[PDB]
Amino acid sequence: DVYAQEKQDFVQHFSQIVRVLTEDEMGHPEIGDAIARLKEVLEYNAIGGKYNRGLTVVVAFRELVEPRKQDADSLQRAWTVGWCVELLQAFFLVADDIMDSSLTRRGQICWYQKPGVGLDAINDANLLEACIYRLLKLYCREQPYYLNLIELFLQSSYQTEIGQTLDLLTAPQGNVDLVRFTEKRYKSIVKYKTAFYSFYLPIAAAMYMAGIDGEKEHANAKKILLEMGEFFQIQDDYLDLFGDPSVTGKIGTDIQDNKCSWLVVQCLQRATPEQYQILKENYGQKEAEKVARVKALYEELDLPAVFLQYEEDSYSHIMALIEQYAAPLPPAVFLGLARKIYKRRK
Amino acid sequence: DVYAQEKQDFVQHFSQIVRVLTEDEMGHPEIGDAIARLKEVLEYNAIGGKYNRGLTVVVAFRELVEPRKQDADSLQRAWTVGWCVELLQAFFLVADDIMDSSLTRRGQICWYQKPGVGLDAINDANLLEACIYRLLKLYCREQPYYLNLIELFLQSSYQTEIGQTLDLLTAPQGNVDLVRFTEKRYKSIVKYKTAFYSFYLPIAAAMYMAGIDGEKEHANAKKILLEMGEFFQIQDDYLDLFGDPSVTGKIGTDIQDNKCSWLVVQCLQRATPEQYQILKENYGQKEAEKVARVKALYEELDLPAVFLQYEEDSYSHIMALIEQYAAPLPPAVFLGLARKIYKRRK
Numbered sequence A, B: 001d002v003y004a005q006e007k008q009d010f011v012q013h014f015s016q017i018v019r020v021l022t023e024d025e026m027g028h029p030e031i032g033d034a035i036a037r038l039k040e041v042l043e044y045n046a047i048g049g050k051y052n053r054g055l056t057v058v059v060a061f062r063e064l065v066e067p068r069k070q071d072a073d074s075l076q077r078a079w080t081v082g083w084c085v086e087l088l089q090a091f092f093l094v095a096d097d098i099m100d101s102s103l104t105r106r107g108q109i110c111w112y113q114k115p116g117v118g119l120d121a122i123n124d125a126n127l128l129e130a131c132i133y134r135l136l137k138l139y140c141r142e143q144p145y146y147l148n149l150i151e152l153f154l155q156s157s158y159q160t161e162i163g164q165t166l167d168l169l170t171a172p173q174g175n176v177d178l179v180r181f182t183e184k185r186y187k188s189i190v191k192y193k194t195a196f197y198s199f200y201l202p203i204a205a206a207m208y209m210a211g212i213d214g215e216k217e218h219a220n221a222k223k224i225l226l227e228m229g230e231f232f233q234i235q236d237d238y239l240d241l242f243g244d245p246s247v248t249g250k251i252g253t254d255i256q257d258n259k260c261s262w263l264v265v266q267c268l269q270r271a272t273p274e275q276y277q278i279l280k281e282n283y284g285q286k287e288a289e290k291v292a293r294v295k296a297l298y299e300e301l302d303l304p305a306v307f308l309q310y311e312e313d314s315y316s317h318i319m320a321l322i323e324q325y326a327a328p329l330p331p332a333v334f335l336g337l338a339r340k341i342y343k344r345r346k
């Protein structure tokens, strides 16, 4: 709602992002075709999602900066840093789609699945990542938060890469152990792979933009935002099987890819020993009838109801955590973002 | 020789690089297995090469800093930033080996060809890249060049990514045009893909470390170092076909992968029209007997002698350029590095 009003202005800022990334180096004409490829890379892989992470930067920045400091320029930078978060997303997703062997993202074919792209997508991703640092220098080089922002985006990438390594190490292809799929391991994976970049990064970005740089106000924000990130990823895992691909824009692969999904952890916690074996025989394999058998087993332990039950308790806990740690920040910052992910199905 | 003395001290600094990258986050035990994977990623993909780029940082830093400023700490940082260049290399190479479909690198199997790695290598690469920025913060956070160094490593990555995009766009699989393979296009490709990160980056890194930050002293260094980078890449293209894989540590793929190699550009400049057609029919295809036919054609126009002739003229020109633009820097800086690549065959 605070999100939904601001969407349109934020999406229109994208034409200029692209202009400035295409223009400022087209005074080197020799790379023109590279630049043209960048444009394509951006339009295919930055557009088409819900923009919530990039919107979170703009919304929070509105709520933390005094409106007499929100000049036209200061807002440009807010929307630009918003788009920097978006490009980080795009970067990890393009590479994740390859490592996860996914088919669709945001309602279209994955970039690496497009005829004539393939594993060139690897360098496409890396460019998306560089564009972040290009814009920071363009729009924020002279701000006193410029270095905070750079360290923040770099630190959040390392964290999410450490998370992916854990994601991939725990899901080796053609190689079961059910046994590594614990709660402790799960929470660790999801903390690093999703929670820093999807929640802490954008709010912190907007904190540094407003001049709130103190270690304690960041750690407290962090406490709320990691826990919301855990919830968000459990939701992502539930939607990978039980979501509607016309809503989510994507087809699940967690069972196939042998993943430490929340579903499988819960499953294992509930399974009779012979249910265990059915899982053993059928998990992490590409065969459609073996996936279907796992799903049935999940359904047979009411894991969709266990998800709906988790969602309520997590929500109540995040809200407790907001009552606890929001101060001295406006609680609307956390509340608007919790509203945005509660009940969600894309 | 200045290189060859300093090698051993530089390579021994690698144990500590790895220690500090493994230690400083092992106070989070939950990621321990990620960290262990990093260690592996580093030992396989940072070790085994000639270290010339990372050595160039240490050598030049010795030559530009007054020896009364080369305290133990100041040298730590030199060797560390040396290793940061090395990790940039490692990052691009791991990804290049995938996009080039290569077999071996540095005398062993490519990381992505190892059983149980595969396309997980994508995230391995990204980590290598993050490690650069981790070390900069660890060893240089309080230096007045810290931000110059960060912008330099980021800018050099964007440039080399723009170069790779050009490299890949000009070499679409199963799709000849001989016709895009010009001199102008060639020089552009090689400038961006190799010349900034392999030559300008390390010397500039060492300039910023010595407090030489002026735009004019950088542009002049740049003028020498881009041209040396062009030469170095033409050498790389010649070795891809005519090099000895026990020296180079790697097997060629430029013809197979349909690349704008220097060899093919030269070829096209020399070809009778019916030689042209032989090239047309045989270039950019995986079939061993069609590659052999191209090689024969290259040999039939004495392109190895044309390479030996280019090498001499380029050398004389780089030396002219050094006479022109080295000032006020010690010419030994450029000379030691030109000695290192003249006559080279790994």
Ligand SMILES: C=C1CCC[C@@H]2[C@@](C)(CC3=CC(=O)C=CC3=O)[C@H](C)CC[C@]12C
Pocket: A046, A048, A049, A050, A051, A052, A053, A054, A055, A082, A083, A085, A086, A087, A089, A093, A106, A198, A236, A346
């Ligand atoms: C799984 C996700 C969680 C993180 C967000 C991300 C978005 C919503 C896109 C998006 C673009 C942007 O510019 C800024 C923020 C964004 O969130 C995509 C569509 C689907 C959900 C996904 C992939």
Ligand SMILES: C=C1CCC[C@@H]2[C@@](C)(CC3=CC(=O)C=CC3=O)[C@H](C)CC[C@]12C
Pocket: B046, B048, B049, B050, B051, B052, B053, B054, B055, B082, B083, B085, B086, B087, B089, B093, B106, B198, B236, B346
């Ligand atoms: C093609 C190249 C040109 C750039 C350098 C690079 C090295 C020599 C490794 C290396 C490691 C390091 O830490 C610092 C510098 C380095 O050069 C590898 C072995 C082969 C040549 C290669 C791949």
Ligand SMILES: O=P(O)(O)C(O)(Cn1ccnc1)P(=O)(O)O
Pocket: A092, A093, A096, A097, A100, A193, A194, A236, A240
């Ligand atoms: O399930 P994943 O972690 O691979 C995913 O959530 C992507 N992602 C990657 C890192 N954090 C989130 P997606 O379902 O978008 O494929």
Ligand SMILES: O=P(O)(O)C(O)(Cn1ccnc1)P(=O)(O)O
Pocket: B092, B093, B096, B097, B100, B193, B194, B236, B240
């Ligand atoms: O030939 P390439 O450019 O792919 C190569 O030189 C790697 N490289 C990549 C960018 N710059 C240099 P290598 O021969 O090492 O595979």
Ligand SMILES: [Mg+2]
Pocket: A096, A097, A100, A102
């Ligand atoms: Mg995925």
Ligand SMILES: [Mg+2]
Pocket: A096, A100, A167
């Ligand atoms: Mg994934």
Ligand SMILES: [Mg+2]
Pocket: A236, A237, A240
């Ligand atoms: Mg998922």
Ligand SMILES: [Mg+2]
Pocket: B096, B097, B100, B102
């Ligand atoms: Mg290659």
Ligand SMILES: [Mg+2]
Pocket: B096, B100, B167
């Ligand atoms: Mg290549």
Ligand SMILES: [Mg+2]
Pocket: B236, B237, B240
């Ligand atoms: Mg080569």
